[PDB]
Symmetry: C3
Subunit: 239 residues, 3 copies
C-alpha cells in the first residue's frame, strides 16, 4: 500500500547497507537502488546487501537495471532471496518491458524519448502501479546538455514529459512520482518545485538526500464562480 | 452551424429558466447546463425547464451528464421532447462515449487525464463537432488543488491539456473551445487569456457570466522574412 | 550522412540558382526549396534550376511540395534528373505520406495539427531520417494569427509541438530540426532560441538567411548530486 505512505521517497544506493536504517527513518518510502546510484563494479556487492540488510518491504521499492541488460537479470536473481515485491524500472520504454517483470508490481521510470512517446501504453500495463519521470537521463538521451534554464526552471521538453507522466499515471489509476531535485542545497528551488507538483496532483516527490524529505512533506501540505471541482480542490487541500 | 456564431459562449444552469432569455441576448451561443451548474436535487426541475422554455436550437447547446450515469439517461429522455441537436459531454473519456450519443452532434469536454490521453480518438469520433477542455475538473480528478499559479497563469499540466485539445480538434476539423475563467471580476486576466486563445486558433472562449462576453468578443478581434503562412496570419486577422 | 554536418541549415529558394553557391558556402546543409519559398508561377523554373545547377548531394536536401499536390508530382519528376536522395516533406501528416516517397530519405516537416497528433507514426516510418516543425504554418492552419508572444517567446501550442517533434524524432533515432527564426535582424532572439534548442538535444536549427548561420553554429557550442546522466551532459558539452 504505497499510496498510504507520505510523499517523501528517498533513493539510497544499495551498496551502502550502513545507511539503510537512516534512510528508512528519514523517508516515507525508500528506493534501494541497484541502477545509476551504484557503480558497475559495486553492483554485485549491492545485490548482497539487498539480501543481507532488509528494510520493511511495505515501505521499500528496489530500482533494478534496465530491460535487456545483464544487470537486470542479476538483479532479479538477487531479488528472489528477498521479500520485496515492487521494483522501479529505469529507462522504461514499452509495455512489454513492464510485463516481463510480472508478477512484481512495477513503478516505470520514463526518462527517454521512446518512453515519453509510449507513456500511456506503459502506464496501462497490468503490473504498473506507478509512473515516474527522470529529467536528467531524458535530456542526456535526447542529446542535450541541461534539464533546466539559468533560473532553475525546467526546459520545455522536460515540462512536456512531466505533464505526460502525470496524465498517463492518472489515466490508469497509478501513482505519479515527480523527478528529483539534484541541487541538494537548493532548498528554495525544491520547495517551489514540490509545491508545484502537489498542486497539480503528483503523489510523490522523489529525493536523493534525506535533508530533502522535510521540505517535500511540508510542500505537500497547503498553506469568482465556484463549481463542483473547485469544492473538490478545497476538500483535497483539507486532506 | 455553430462555427458561424461568434466566440462568446455562455453557460446557463438549466434550472434557471427565468434567465434563459437574458443568456441568449448576451451570448453568441448558450450552453444550457444539466451537469455541474445544477444541484443534483434540482436536475429534474432543470429537465422540465429544458422542455418548457426553449431557446433557438441553432444557437444553443445542452451540457448533459457524464457517460454511464443515471443522470445522463434522464437527460437524453428529456432532450427527446426538445429540438436541441447538439450536446456537450462532460468528463469525455473515449470515442465510445461519444458514439453512444449518435445521432446527436457532440462537443466533447475533456477534463480528466484519461480524456487528455485519448483526445485524438475522441476528436476523431464521427459525432464530434467540437472539443473543449476543463481546467478545474482536470486538476480535481488528477488529485491536485489549483489550476493556476499565484499570478493567474495556468499550471503546466493545464497548458499541456489546453494545447492537446486545440491540436486534437484542429486535426479532425472540429471547433476548439477554451476553458472558462472562473474569476468573473478578473477582466484583465480574461482579456489576456482570450487574446492568447484567439492568437493560436481557438474558436470559442466559454464564459460563466454574461459580463465576460464583451471581453471575449473584443479579445477575438485584432488590435523579418514573410512566407506564405505569415500572409495567412494577416488574412486571419482581417477576418 | 547529414548527422555529420554542423547544425546550420539554410533554406534557399530553388528559383534563385545564382545564390546556390553562396548558400552552400554559408551553411552546413542547404535546403533547396520548391515549396513555400518559390511562387507558384516560378516553380517550373525552379525545377529546371534544380537540374541545371547542382550542389553537393551529401550536403543538400530538397524541400518538395505537400503530399497529394500536383506540384509534388512535378517535383519528383524533376528530382529524377538529379543526384539528390533526401527530400523534406512539408505539411507532413501521416506515415503513408512518407512511405510514398520511398526509396528516398525523408525529413518530415510537421506544421499542422494532424501532423502533430501523428508525429510518432511519421517519425517511425521507414524512410524518415529527420523531423522538423514549422511554427508559422502550424499557427496558420490552426486558424490563429501569431506563433509568438510580444516578447518573442513561442506561444504554448508552439512549445507543445516543438517538444512533440523533438521526442518523436529521438524516439526513433531521427534528426531533430528546430523551427526557423523569421525575424532575421533579431540576432538576440535567435541566439537564445538556438541555445535553448541545443540545450535539449535538437540537432539542427534551420535558417532562412545566411547571416543566421554563424549565430546558430556559435549557439550550439557550450560557453548538488551528480548521477550518470549528468556526466553524459558534461560529455555532450565537450563534444
Ligand atoms: Mg535516470
Ligand atoms: Mg467540469
Ligand atoms: Mg511551412
Amino acid at each position: 500500500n504505497l499510496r498510504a505512505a507520505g510523499p517523501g521517497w528517498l533513493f539510497c544506493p544499495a551498496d551502502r547497507p550502513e545507511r539503510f536504517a537512516k534512510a528508512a527513518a528519514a523517508a516515507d518510502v525508500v528506493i534501494l537502488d541497484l541502477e545509476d546510484g551504484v557503480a558497475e563494479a559495486q553492483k554485485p556487492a549491492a545485490r548482497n546487501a539487498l539480501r543481507d540488510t532488509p528494510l520493511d518491504p511495505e515501505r521499500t521499492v528496489v530500482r533494478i537495471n534496465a530491460g535487456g541488460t545483464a544487470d537486470q537479470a542479476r538483479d532479479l536473481e538477487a531479488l528472489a532471496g528477498t521479500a520485496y515485491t515492487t521494483v522501479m524500472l529505469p529507462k522504461a520504454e514499452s509495455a512489454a518491458q513492464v510485463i516481463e517483470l510480472a508478477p512484481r508490481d512495477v513503478i516505470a521510470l520514463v526518462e527517454t524519448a521512446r518512453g515519453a512517446v509510449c507513456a500511456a501504453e506503459i502506464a496501462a500495463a497490468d503490473p504498473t502501479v506507478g509512473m515516474m519521470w527522470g529529467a536528467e537521463d531524458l535530456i542526456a538521451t535526447l542529446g542535450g546538455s541541461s534539464s533546466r534554464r539559468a533560473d532553475g526552471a525546467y526546459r520545455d521538453v522536460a515540462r512536456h514529459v512531466r505533464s505526460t507522466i502525470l496524465l498517463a499515471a492518472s489515466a490508469f489509476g497509478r501513482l505519479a512520482l515527480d523527478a528529483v531535485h539534484l541541487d541538494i542545497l537548493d532548498v528554495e528551488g525544491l520547495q517551489e518545485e514540490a509545491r508545484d507538483a502537489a498542486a497539480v496532483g503528483f503523489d510523490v516527490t522523489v529525493c536523493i538526500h534525506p535533508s530533502q524529505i522535510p521540505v517535500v512533506r511540508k510542500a505537500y501540505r497547503p498553506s469568482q464562480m465556484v463549481d463542483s471541482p473547485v469544492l473538490t480542490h478545497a476538500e483535497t487541500m483539507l486532506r
